[PDB]
């Protein structure tokens, strides 16, 4: 049964659209496909849904890009739907606007900048090879269980200096953060609250132990960057370390599944990447355009008109990131991966001051992944009549990806 909220007075009937971000109409065909159904040729730039507590949805890439780049009009005070979850959310620096955001982002950047992450290339590659060699000769694997959920998790826990055995409990907290359980705004609010507290509990002893440590992992590197000449307060550290873990695990895992489902159904494009290693390297950004995973929000700072639409202070606008990279007004044949596409403009990493601080790590993990996969498993397909299973929310997920090949 579907929970509806009545539209506020300022939302006119003709902008109402019944869209459930947590269970999209047509989701069984795919996350990307289901979002694309929302973006019809004449659909308004901003539509309002009575589901998930009532919120706007931006339906075109340029509104998405514009909103992300404008913190003074669209604040990060709430970035989750429903509002209750968004209000419970406590991660740093995603909850913050400039200028409070900016020293925390600087601290993160000491650990995650491109020069730093380039150093991690070989560790990443060793992890990739080891996993892949575990099944390359077998001629089949379940990609999700045996690769996508393993690789990025192992990479990050190693980088963060954390025991691999923590993967499960962290994954479950991640799921309740990004796809909270509940069929009502309040239930979802409560699921998020609980997962968030879970992350704070996990993270406090590491913070306590690693302050002034030690200690060369990602966590101690970032934690020990000063904020206005003194140590990071506890409240901020908990949100910051939790966000590192949340971004480090869930996103890449799921990106990988979407990407690999497409590749297994497109041998010609796999073969291009094989024949031309530079097409692969340069084509990774095209994959990020094509397999966005985040759909998150902003808070309308003041009453305003925006793209011909009346907005009220406190309105939430969901930004389905897939609707930028896949916008047919931004890219011709947007559903096709074209490794040679010159314009790959997307918001898979968002825009503005919050543009993904992990983007260099994400790009490197995917490029190493493809290089070592293709080196050992040059050809592959999705099992005959297999049906991947799809989940939507703030971060998209997929499951059940049986690949098959002829061992080389
Ligand atoms: C598939 C890969 C990834 C995607 C699609 C992705 C997406 C995003 C998006 C859309 C944001 C902006 C959220 C907002 O402000 O509304 C973000 C922020 C962030 N991401 Fe990523 N992310 C990915 C991988 C990573 C990784 C591996 C890390 C490493 C820990 C990471 C760390 C962060 C952090 C710390 C922020 C906060 C940035 C800030 O507030 O200044 N992300 N990410």
How would you describe the overall organization of this protein?
This is Cytochrome P450. The protein has 408 residues and is of the alpha+beta class. It has a single domain, classed as Cytochrome p450, CATH 1.10.630. It is built from 16 helices and twelve strands. Bound molecules: protoporphyrin IX containing FE. The site of protoporphyrin IX containing FE has 27 residues, from α4, α12 and α16.
Write the topology of this structure.
Elements: H1 31-38, E1 46-49, E2 55-58, H2 61-68, E3 74-75, H3 83-88, H4 101-112, H5 114-118, H6 121-133, E4 140-142, H7 143-148, H8 151-160, H9 167-178, H10 185-210, H11 218-223, H12 234-263, H13 267-275, H14 277-290, E5 295-300, E6 304-306, E7 309-311, E8 316-320, H15 322-325, H16 359-376, E9 381-382, E10 389-391, E11 397-399, E12 402-404
Parallel strand pairs: 2-8
Antiparallel strand pairs: 1-2, 3-5, 4-12, 5-8, 6-7, 9-12, 10-11
Bound molecules: protoporphyrin IX containing FE.
């Amino acid at each position: 049964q579907k929970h509806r909220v009545a539209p506020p007075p300022h939302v006119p009937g003709h902008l109402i659209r019944e869209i459930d971000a947590y269970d999209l109409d047509g989701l069984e065909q795919g996350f990307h496909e289901a979002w694309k159904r929302v973006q019809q040729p004449d659909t308004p730039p901003l539509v309002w849904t009575p589901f998930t507590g009532g919120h706007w949805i931006a339906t075109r890439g340029t509104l998405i890009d514009e909103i992300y780049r404008s913190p003074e009009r669209f604040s990060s005070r709430v970035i989750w739907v429903p509002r209750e979850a968004g209000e419970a959310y406590d991660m740093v620096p995603t909850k913050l606007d400039p200028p409070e955001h900016t020293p925390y982002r600087k601290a993160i950047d000491k650990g995650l900048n491109l020069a730093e992450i380039r150093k991690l290339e070989d560790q990443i590659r060793t992890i990739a090879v080891e996993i892949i060699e575990g099944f390359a000769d077998r001629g089949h694997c379940e990609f999700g269980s045996e690769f996508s959920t393993v690789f990025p998790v192992r990479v990050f826990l190693a980088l963060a200096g954390l025991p691999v055995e923590d993967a499960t409990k962290l994954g479950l907290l991640a799921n309740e953060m990004t796809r909270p359980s509940g069929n009502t705004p309040e239930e979802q609010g409560r699921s998020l609250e609980a997962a968030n507290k879970g992350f704070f509990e996990y993270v406090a002893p590491i913070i306590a132990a690693r302050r002034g440590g030690s200690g060369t992992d990602l966590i101690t590197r970032i934690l020990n960057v000063e904020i206005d000449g003194k140590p990071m307060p506890d409240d901020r550290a908990l949100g910051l370390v939790s966000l590192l873990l949340l971004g480090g695990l869930d996103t890449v895992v799921n990106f990988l599944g979407f990407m690999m489902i497409y590749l297994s159904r497109h041998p010609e494009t796999v073969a291009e990447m094989r024949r031309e290693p530079l097409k692969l390297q340069r084509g990774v950004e095209e994959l990020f355009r094509r397999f966005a995973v985040v759909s998150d929000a902003r808070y309308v700072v003041s009453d305003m008109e925006f793209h011909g639409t009346m907005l009220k202070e406190g309105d939430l606008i969901l930004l389905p990131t897939a609707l930028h990279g896949l916008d047919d007004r931004h890219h011709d044949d947007p559903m096709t991966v074209d490794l040679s596409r010159r314009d790959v403009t997307h918001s898979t990493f968002a825009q503005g001051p919050h543009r993904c601080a992990g983007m260099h790590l994400a790009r490197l993990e995917v490029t190493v992944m493809l290089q070592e996969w293709l080196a050992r498993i040059p050809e592959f397909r999705l099992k005959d009549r297999a049906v991947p299973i799809y989940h939507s929310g703030i971060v998209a997920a997929v499951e059940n990806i049986p690949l098959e090949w002829e061992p080389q």
